[PDB]
Amino acid sequence: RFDLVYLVLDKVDEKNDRELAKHLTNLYLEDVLPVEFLTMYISYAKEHIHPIITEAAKTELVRAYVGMRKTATTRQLESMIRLAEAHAKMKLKNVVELEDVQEAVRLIRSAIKD
Amino acid sequence: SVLAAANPIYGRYDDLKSPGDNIDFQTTILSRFDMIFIVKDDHNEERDISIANHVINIHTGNANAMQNQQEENGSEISIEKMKRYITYCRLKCAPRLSPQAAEKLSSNFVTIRKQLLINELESTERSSIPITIRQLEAIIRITESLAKLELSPIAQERHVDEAIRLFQASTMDAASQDPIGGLNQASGTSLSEIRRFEQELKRRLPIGWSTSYQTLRREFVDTHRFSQLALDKALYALEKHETIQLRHQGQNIYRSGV
Amino acid sequence: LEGGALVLADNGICCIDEFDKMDESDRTAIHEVMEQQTISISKAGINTTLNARTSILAAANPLYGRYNPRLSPLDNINLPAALLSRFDILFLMLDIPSRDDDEKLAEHVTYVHMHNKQPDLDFTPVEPSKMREYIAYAKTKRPVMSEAVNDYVVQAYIRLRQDSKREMDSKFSFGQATPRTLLGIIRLSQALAKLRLADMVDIDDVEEALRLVRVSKESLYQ
Amino acid sequence: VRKDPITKEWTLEGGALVLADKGVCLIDEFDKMNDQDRTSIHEAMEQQSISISKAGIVTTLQARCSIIAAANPNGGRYNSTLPLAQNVSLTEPILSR
Amino acid sequence: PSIYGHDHIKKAILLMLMGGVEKNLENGSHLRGDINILMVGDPSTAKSQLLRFVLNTASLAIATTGRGSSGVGLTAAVTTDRETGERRLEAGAMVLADRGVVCIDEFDKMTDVDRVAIHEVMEQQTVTIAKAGIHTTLNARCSVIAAANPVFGQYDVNRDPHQNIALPDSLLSRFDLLFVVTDDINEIRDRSISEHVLRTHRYLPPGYLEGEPVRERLNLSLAVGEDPKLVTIPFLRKYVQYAKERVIPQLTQEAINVIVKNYTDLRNDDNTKKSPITARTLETLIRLATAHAKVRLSKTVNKVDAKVAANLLRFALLGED
DNA sequence: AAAAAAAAAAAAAAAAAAAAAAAAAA
DNA sequence: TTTTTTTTTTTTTTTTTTTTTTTTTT
Ligand SMILES: Nc1ncnc2c1ncn2[C@@H]1O[C@H](COP(=O)(O)OP(=O)(O)OP(=O)(O)O)[C@@H](O)[C@H]1O
Ligand SMILES: [Mg+2]
C-alpha cells in the first residue's frame, strides 16, 4: 500500500567510497540553497493551487498503463495520477500536461528498477 | 497430617506405558508421603456382582436396616465414640520401640533399599517412586501408631510385622510395577532373544512332560546364550497360560499348552 | 519535572554497569542519546526537549557465562547490532588460563592483603589532583585540523573497506566497516591531539588512533 | 473472591454454577474450551459442592446443578469406523461423570 | 551429633561461625569477612536439619523460606509511627541480622523479583532505600547459608553442572563453598545409617516414664527465679564467642606461598569442576585460612591453616576427598 | 456577663493478594 | 499447537479524638 518504496544500497566501490569520504572530511574541515523560501512556496502551493487533468494526460496515461501491463496492479495507475498531479502543482501551473505524466512514469518505473 | 487424592495422566493408569510417563509428581513431593496407593480396576465378574449388590442395597434402603444391628452388637462403633477414643489415645499414650524391633526394621530397610538398585540397574532409568530414610521413619511411625491402638507402652515385633506388610502393600507395590515390555534400550537384545528362547524351549519340550530350571540353565547356558534376565521370561511365558507352569516348590517346569 | 541520569551528566561520563540486564525502556533513551543527544520528555502536557550531550561507558556480561566458540559476537551478548554499532569502541577481555599470569596476579593480590599498601614498584603514582587539573585543562583546549592531515584518512578508510569486503569470515570481525568508523577515527584523534598537542594535529596521531582501534578490533580473538 | 468496597474484607461472590443451584447449567461448544476452565467443574459434577481456600477464607459452598453439554467431534464430524476415544479429546475422568 | 556423616559440611559450618577478618580499604571499600555456603543435593539428605541447628547454636540467626518471602520483607518497609505521627522505616530480615547469619530454605523456589534484592545484599552488604522521601543507606553484614534442589528431582551426572542448577551465574558466584551432595545406594552405608537412626528414635528424656507423652507445656511455670571425646554445646558457644572477640590474626608470607601455589595449580588443570574457578578463589583461601587461624587461638596465619583451607576447597570443588 | 452547644483537625499510602488478558515456547 | 510463561491492573479514603477556640442564648 506504500506509494513509493526505495531501496538504498551500499556496495564497496572505490570511486563511491572515496567520493563520500572526501566530502565528509571536507565538511569536517573548517574553512543555491534557499533558507525559508521552501516553506512559503510549499504553503502557497498547498493552500491556493488546485490543478486539473486534460485529455493530453489521458492519452499518455492509458497507453503507459497498458504498456506496463504488456504484474502492475490497478494501484499503479492511481499512483501515477497522484505523482503527475503533484508535479503539476510544482513549476506552478493550473493544469497537467505531458511533462508531468512523463516525470511521474519515469519516477515510478525507476522505482520498479529497484 | 495430609490426605491427598489424585488421578494419573490420561485418566487411567495405562499399564502399557512406563511409570515415569504416568505420574507427574516430582521426587521432591513424593518423598514426603509415608504411604502411596495406586488404585486400579480388575474388571472381574464376581467382584462386579458383589459390588453391584452392595450398592443396590444402599439405594433400596436395606443398608440402615442392617447397619444399626452390627453397630449395636459388638462389631462397629459410632463416629462420636471413635472420635473420643482417638482423642483419649492421642492424649494418653506415646509408645516406644524395643531392641528387637529396631533389629527387625534395619534388615527390612536394607532389603527394600537393595531391591531398588537391581530394579534401577535392570530398567537403566531412575525410579519415579523413591525410597529414602524417610521411608524408614515412616515404618517406625506406623509401628508406633499400631501400638497406640492398644494403649501399649512398648512396640514389639507383632506390630513391626504388620507395619512391614502395610508398607509392602502400599509403596513397594507401587515401586514394583514390573513392566512386561517397554521396547526401550534396556533388554534391547532381549527383543529378539525372547522369541528365540521361546522357540528353542517349545521345540525341545512337547506339550507333555517337564524339565528343571537347573537343566534349562546349565545346558542352554553352556552355549553362552545366558542373559541374566531369564528369571522373568519364564513367568512371561506362564502369563500366556499355556507355555509354562511352575510346580513342586518352583523346581519343576511343566509344559501345559501351545 | 525530574530529569534522568542521562540528562544529569552533561559534558560528563555515564557509567552503566550491568548493561545486559537493563530493560528496553532504558534502551530507547540510550538509542536516542547517541543519535541526537536531546531527550524528549514525558507526556504530562509539557512537550519539553532537554540537552543531554554525554559520553557513555558501558560494562557488559556475555550470555550464559563466558566466551563461547560460537563464532558470532552477536551470539555472545543480547545487545542488538545497531546498538553496538553506535558505540565508538568495543573491548573484549576474555579470561584465558595461563600458568605465568596467574602467579603474578596471585602475588599482586596477596601483597595488598599482607600489607595494606600497594606493592612498591618503579612505576610512580601521579597525584590525583594533578590528574584532575591536567584533564580539565586538556578539556578546555580546542584543537584544529588541516587539509593535508585528513587526506591520509581517506586512504586509511579505503584500505579498511577493501579489507572489510574480504574480512567477512566465519569467526573474526563484526560485520563490515561503516562511515561511522571513519567518523570515530577522527573523533578519537581529537582526544589524542588534546592530550599534549595543540593547533594542527600530527600525522602520527592518526596512526596512534588507528592502532588503538585495531587492537580493540583484534581483541575479538583475545 | 473480591474485596468488599464498603467493609473492605475479602468476600465470596457467586458464579454460573452457583446461580443455577437446583437448576440447569448449559455449556455450548464444550470441546472448544481451555482445560483449566473445563477441569473446574469436576467437583461440582459429582460431589455437588464447591470448596474455596483463598485469602483467609476457607469455605465449602453447595451447587446442586445438572449439566447438559454440546460438543463437536474431532475434524468436525464423526467417524463411525472408529471407537469413541479417538473421536473426542476428553479423557475418562470427565466422560465417566 | 544427631546427623550421620557430612564431616566436611560440618567443618565449613564451624568455619562460618568464626568469620574472617574484615579489611577496610581506601575509596570507601571493605573486603567482606563472611563465609557463604550453598548446599545442592537430593531429597532427604539432611540439608534442612543443619539450617535448623545453625539457627539454635549461633548467637544471631534469622530463618527464611523462598516462597514465603518478599523483597520489601527482606530489606525494609515504610510504615508509620502511631504515637508521634511521622513516617519511618521498619527493618527486614537481612538488616535485622547484622553481624549474624541468615538461613534460607528452598532457595531455588524464590521468585526472580525477590532474588535481585538478595543479590545486592550479597555484594555491597548495604541496602538503599529511596522511597516516600526516605533516602537512606542501611548496614547489613550477614553470613548466608542456603539449601536448594536441582532442576529435576535428583542430581544427574550425565548432564553439565549448569543444567542441573537453575540459579543464575551472577548469584552463584557470590557463594564461597558450593556443596553438591548425593545419596548413593550401598548396603554397608544403609546398615550403618539405619542403625544410627533407630538408635536415635529410642531416646527417653530424664524424668519421663516409658509410654508417657512428652509434656512440652511447662505447666505455666515459666521460671523459678527471675534474674574420642565430645564437648557440650554451651562450651562451644563460649569458645566461639571468645575466639570472635579476642583474636585477630594477620597474614604471613609463608602462608601466602602455599596459597599462591594452590591457586596456580587449581587454575591450570583440565579437571572438570562443578563450579568454575576465577580470581575470587584466592580471597576464599585467605578467608578460610584466617578462620582456621582463629580456631587455633593464634595471632598469625600458619602453613597448616593454608593446607586445611586448600583441602576443604579441593573437596568442595572436585570431590577428590 | 455568663451558660450550653457545635463543630474543625484529619491524612495517606505503600505493600500484598487475586484475576484476565496479551506474548513467549516442547 | 497447546501448552507453559509473562506484564498489570485497581484494589485504597467513612473515620477521631478530647481539648482549644468560636457563636448563640438564657
Ligand atoms: N544423614 C542423616 N542422618 C540422620 N537423619 C537423616 C539423615 N539424612 C536424612 N535424615 C532424616 O531425613 C528426614 C528428612 O531430612 P531433611 O528434612 O533434612 O531433608 P532435606 O534435604 O531438607 O529434604 P528436601 O529435599 O525434601 O527438602 C529427617 O527425619 C532426617 O532426620
Ligand atoms: Mg528441606
Cell of D79: 467417524
C14 CA to F1 C1' distance (Å): 76
Rounded to a whole number of angstroms, the distance from the CA of E36 to the nearest CA of chain C is 20
C61 is in an annotated binding site: yes
Amino acid code (one letter) for E321: D
Amino acid code (one letter) for D75: G
Contacts of E201 in chain B (CB under 8 A): 97, 137, 140
Instruction: Give the nearest chain A residue to C159 (CA atoms).
Output: A14
Amino acid code (one letter) for D30: F
In this structure, are residues B147 and B95 in contact, taking their beta carbons and an 8 Å threshold? yes
> Does residue C48 lie within any of the structural domains?
yes
Cβ burial C40-50 (10 Å sphere, 16+ → b, else e): eeeeeeeeeee
Q: What is the rounded distance in angstroms from the CA atom of residue E75 to the CA atom of residue E113?
A: 13
> Does residue C221 lie within any of the structural domains?
no
| Structural domains counted in chain C | 1
- Print the domain residue range for C35: 1-216
Burial category of E126 from C-beta neighbours within 10 Å (exposed 0-12, middle 13-18, buried 19 and up): middle
> Does residue C222 lie within any of the structural domains?
no
Cβ burial C11-33 (10 Å sphere, 16+ → b, else e): eeebeeeebeeeeeeeeebbeeb
Those residues whose C-beta lies under 8 Å from the C-beta of residue B225, and which sit 6 or more positions away, are: B193, B197
Coil, strand or helix at C173: coil
Q: What is the rounded distance in angstroms from the CA atom of residue E33 to the CA atom of residue E26?
A: 17
Give the A-side interface with C, CB within 8 Å: 12, 14, 17-18, 20-22, 24-25, 28-30
Those residues whose C-beta lies under 8 Å from the C-beta of residue C220, and which sit 6 or more positions away, are: C73, C92, C172, C173, C174
> Does residue C158 lie within any of the structural domains?
yes
Q: To what resolution in angstroms was this structure determined?
A: 3.3
Cell of B256: 501345559
Q: Which helix (H) or strand (E) holds E63?
A: strand E61-65
E292 CB less than 6 Å from ligand 1?
Answer: no
Within a 10 A sphere around the Cβ of B215, how many other Cβ atoms?
10
Q: What is the rounded distance in angstroms from the CA atom of residue B158 to the CA atom of residue C138?
A: 95
Q: How far apart are the first and last CA of chain D?
A: 27
Beta-strand pair C49-51/B245-247: unpaired
Coil, strand or helix at E303: helix
> Does residue C187 lie within any of the structural domains?
yes
**Whose C-alpha lies nearest to ligand 1, atom 29?**
B134
Looking up cell 467417524 gives: D79
Looking up cell 458464579 gives: D15
In this structure, are residues E278 and E285 in contact, taking their beta carbons and an 8 Å threshold? no
Coil, strand or helix at E106: coil
Q: What is the rounded distance in angstroms from the CA atom of residue B217 to the CA atom of residue B230?
A: 9
Counting as contact any 3 or more CB pairs under 8 A, the partners of D are: B
One-character DSSP codes across A6-36 = --------HHHHHHHHHHHHHHHS-----SS
In this structure, are residues B192 and B233 in contact, taking their beta carbons and an 8 Å threshold? no
Written in H, E and C, the secondary structure of chain D is CEECCCCCCEECCCCHHHHCCCEEEEECCCCCCCHHHHHHHHHHHHCCEEEEEECCEEEEEECCEEEEECCCCHHHCCCCCCCHHHCCCCCHHHHCC
Residue D60: closest CA among D51, D69, D68: D51
Cβ burial C123-140 (10 Å sphere, 16+ → b, else e): eeeeeeeeeeeeeeeeee
**Cβ contact A24–C182 (<8 Å):** yes
Residues 113-142 of E with CB under 7 A from strand F: 131-132
Rounded to the nearest angstrom, the gap between the alpha carbon of residue D66 and the centroid of all alpha carbons in its chain is 11
Cell of A84: 503527475
Contacts of E108 in chain B (CB under 8 A): none
One-character DSSP codes across chain B = --------TTSS--TTS-GGGT----HHHHTT-S----------HHHHHHHHHHHHHHHTTHHHHHHHHHHHHTS---HHHHHHHHHHHHHH----B-HHHHHHHHHHHHHHHHHHHHHHHHHTS--SS---HHHHHHHHHHHHHHHHHTT-SSB-HHHHHHHHHHHIIIIIHHH----S---SSTTTTHHHHHHHHHHHHHHHS-SS-EEEHHHHHHHHHHTT---S-THHHHHHHHHTTSS-EEETTTTEEE----
Cell of E168: 543464575
Q: What is the rounded distance in angstroms from the CA atom of residue E65 to the CA atom of residue E44?
A: 17
In this structure, are residues C10 and C51 in contact, taking their beta carbons and an 8 Å threshold? yes
Q: What is the rounded distance in angstroms from the CA atom of residue E52 to the CA atom of residue E63?
A: 8
Q: What is the rounded distance in angstroms from the CA atom of residue E148 to the CA atom of residue E41?
A: 7
> Does residue C91 lie within any of the structural domains?
yes
Rounded to the nearest angstrom, the gap between the alpha carbon of residue E136 and the centroid of all alpha carbons in its chain is 28
Q: How was this structure determined?
A: cryo-EM
Cell of D15: 458464579
Cβ burial C198-221 (10 Å sphere, 16+ → b, else e): eeebeeebbeebbeebeeebeebe
Cell of C51: 540537552
- Please tell me the distance between residue E93's alpha carbon and the centre of ligand 2 in angstroms: 20
In this structure, are residues E320 and E275 in contact, taking their beta carbons and an 8 Å threshold? no
Domain containing residue C193: CATH number:
3.40.50.300
Looking up cell 536441582 gives: E150
- Please tell me the distance between residue E68's alpha carbon and the centre of ligand 1 in angstroms: 21
Cell of B61: 434402603
Q: What is the rounded distance in angstroms from the CA atom of residue A13 to the CA atom of residue A33?
A: 29
- Please tell me the distance between residue E50's alpha carbon and the centre of ligand 2 in angstroms: 10
Question: Which residues are registered as beta bridge partners of B123?
Answer: none
E50 CB less than 6 Å from ligand 1?
Answer: no
Cell of E191: 546398615
Contacts of D92 in chain B (CB under 8 A): 10-12
